[PDB]
Copies of this chain bind each other. A is one copy, B any other.
Amino acid sequence: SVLYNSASFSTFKCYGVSPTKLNDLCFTNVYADSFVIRGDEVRQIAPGQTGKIADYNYKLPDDFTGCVIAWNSNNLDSKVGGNYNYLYRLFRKSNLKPFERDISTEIYQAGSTPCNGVEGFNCYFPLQSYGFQPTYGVGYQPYRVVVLSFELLHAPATVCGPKKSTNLVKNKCVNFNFNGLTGTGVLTESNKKFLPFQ
């Protein structure tokens, strides 16, 4: 609920699995999947839409349960001079498998001459860095997409939505919902003692 009506996770785009309906169905495992983006990665972050980043920086089969969450981080981290802390792969050889983390650090063979020790012609780096500054344009402003992959493994789902519990009234019969116990009757105070776990 807080993420939905947070009024701060401005690009909370969960087209598909309904955040409006999430609050009763259980998932066994959820996934923290966060990176840094720019104002151009917004449209680039569109599962189904492809591009440089979708092919060489992050991975996607085509479909996965799990939303995307970005919001303006320009005020958070943007120094005059250029935010060189963050960086990005630019051009890989080809794609990879759906959804695996990669920190491959090597030299890209760009053309005819084999690299085989050389870094010059035909042998450039795909690894570049960012230079974020306060005047950066909208299409470049960092918003930090974060993913919420929900996998429901065959085992019973352990993390669930909340339980909306109201007050109990006695000496006048009601329907009742004591966690499975759903009868219909009067509840009253009682004396007979129970053991610590029954």
Contact = CB atoms under 8 A, between A and B. Distances in A.
User: Which DSSP category, helix, strand, loop or mixed, fits chain A's interface?
Assistant: loop
Assembly stoichiometry (copies) = 2
Interface in A47-78: none
Interface residues on A, range: under 10
A122 to B, nearest CB: 9
Interface in A1-33: 4-5, 20
Contact of A112 (B5, B111, B112): B5
A118 to B, nearest CB: 18
Interface in A117-174: none
Contacts of A20: 111
Nearest to A112: B5
Contacts of A4: 112
Query: Most B CB atoms within 10 A — which of A4, A5, A20, A112?
Result: A112
Nearest to A4: B112
Contacts of A5: 112
A146 to B, nearest CB: 18
Contacts of A112: 4-5
Nearest first, the 3 A-B pairs at minimum CB distance are A5-B112, A4-B112, A20-B111
Interface of A: 4-5, 20, 111-112
3 contacts: A4-B112, A5-B112, A20-B111
